[PDB]
């Protein structure tokens, strides 16, 4: 992981680790949530800490925080790959992948498909039954 990304994830961690001791406590997390309009109980805060606290000592340290942030970054990079794929297929940018668009891009990607093959692919994905693949449908097929 790049040191630029570490410094970035450190700035994020510092929003929770409000005193820079290197740990996020339930008390700190309580202040965070209160600052955003909630008023959590000790139990609720222990639950939230436990989402990230890998060694179960009841606090989150920066290595545990960074493990979580790196997993989320891989999720966001996957999501961005699928979003870019949708833009490439949606040649005219109207939010729908048509059969014509699917066939034309597949040709460019080294896969020559016939009409019936393309139509079967659209039916597999076309949850709402309108004959085209919108972004929501695409995500469902691609995840």
């Amino acid at each position: 992981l790049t040191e630029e990304q570490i410094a970035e994830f450190k700035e994020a961690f510092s929003l929770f680790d409000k005193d820079g001791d290197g740990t996020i406590t339930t008390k700190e997390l309580g202040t965070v949530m209160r600052s955003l309009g909630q008023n959590p109980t000790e139990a609720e805060l222990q639950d939230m800490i436990n989402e990230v606290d890998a060694d179960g000592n009841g606090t989150i340290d920066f290595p545990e925080f960074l493990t979580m942030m790196a997993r989320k970054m891989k999720d966001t990079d996957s999501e961005e790959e699928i979003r870019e794929a949708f833009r490439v297929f949606d040649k005219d940018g109207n939010g729908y992948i048509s059969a014509a668009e699917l066939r034309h891009v597949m040709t460019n990607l080294g896969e020559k498909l016939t009409d019936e093959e393309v139509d079967e692919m659209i039916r597999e994905a076309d949850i709402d039954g309108d004959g085209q693949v919108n972004y929501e449908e695409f995500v469902q097929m691609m995840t």
């Binding site: 790959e81 699928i82 870019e84 794929a85 490439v88 597949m106 460019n108 990607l109 080294g110 896969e111 498909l113 093959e117 692919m121 597999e124 994905a125 097929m141 691609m142």
Partner: peptide, 13 residues
């Protein structure tokens, strides 16, 4: 053709 290849193909392109 599964959609997973189409993602892989796109990545190479």
């Amino acid at each position: 053709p599964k959609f997973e290849e189409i993602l892989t193909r796109l990545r190479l392109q």
